[PDB]
């Protein structure tokens, strides 16, 4: 009934793109 390892890895992959998008926002907020 608990979670699986593939759900945790999918959560890491689906949170990888907020890291890229926050990197884009931080870069354009610096300049």
């Amino acid at each position: 009934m608990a979670l699986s390892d593939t759900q945790i890895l999918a959560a890491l992959v689906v949170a990888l793109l907020p890291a890229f998008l926050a990197f884009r926002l931080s870069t354009e907020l610096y300049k």
Binding site: L3, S4, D5, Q7, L9
Partner: protein
């Protein structure tokens, strides 16, 4: 110390990464940045 949850192998590498590997390269990049000209 182990993990009963799913993916117990993952904090075994994420705790030293965010503890050492993330702050060492963050302080390295920041010290290179704030002391350059």
């Amino acid at each position: 110390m182990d993990g009963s949850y799913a993916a117990s192998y993952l904090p075994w590498i994420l705790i030293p990464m965010v503890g050492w590997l993330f702050p060492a390269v963050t302080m390295g990049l920041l010290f290179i940045h704030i002391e350059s000209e």
